[PDB]
What we know:
With about 160 residues, this protein is of the alpha+beta class. The protein has 2 helices and 6 strands. This is Target of rapamycin complex 2 subunit sin1.
Amino acid sequence: GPGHMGSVSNAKAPTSALRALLEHKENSSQNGPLAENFACFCGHAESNALCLNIYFPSSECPSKPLFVELRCNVLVSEAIGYILLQYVNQQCVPPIEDEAQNPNYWNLRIVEDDGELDEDFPALDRVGPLCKFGFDAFALVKACPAQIKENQACYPFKSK
C-alpha cells in the first residue's frame, strides 16, 4: 500500500544479483516451430550464418530491409521462405501470395553501395548459396518466364 512508502528492504547483501538473471539453469536456444519447416536453412542455431538486407524495387522505405540469415550449405530459397515466417512472427509488412513463394518466381539482383541496381546480372538464387558473395545486401529483380525457366530448368523445385 502507499502507506508503506518505498519498496526496498535493508537486508544484508554483500554481493548483488537481483538486477541480473540468476543462472542455476541450462543456457540454450530453441528453433521456432515453423522455423524448422523454413528457417531450418536460415542457420538459426548457426551463429556463423550470414545476415542479409533486401531492397525491393518499390522499397519506398530503404530503411526497412528484410533481415534474415542463410547457410553456406543451403540455397537462397530460404530468403523468400522467411517471408511466411515474417508475416506471422511480426504481424507486419503486407502478405505475399503463397503461389509466389517459389523462389524461382522472384530473382535477387546485386546492388552497389550507391544503391544502384544491376539488371545486367542476376544474384545467386535457388541456383546456389547466397553468402557466396559474403555481402549482406541485395535487391529483388523481376524474374519473367525467361529467367524462371533457366533457374527452374537448372535447379527444379522439390514437389510436395
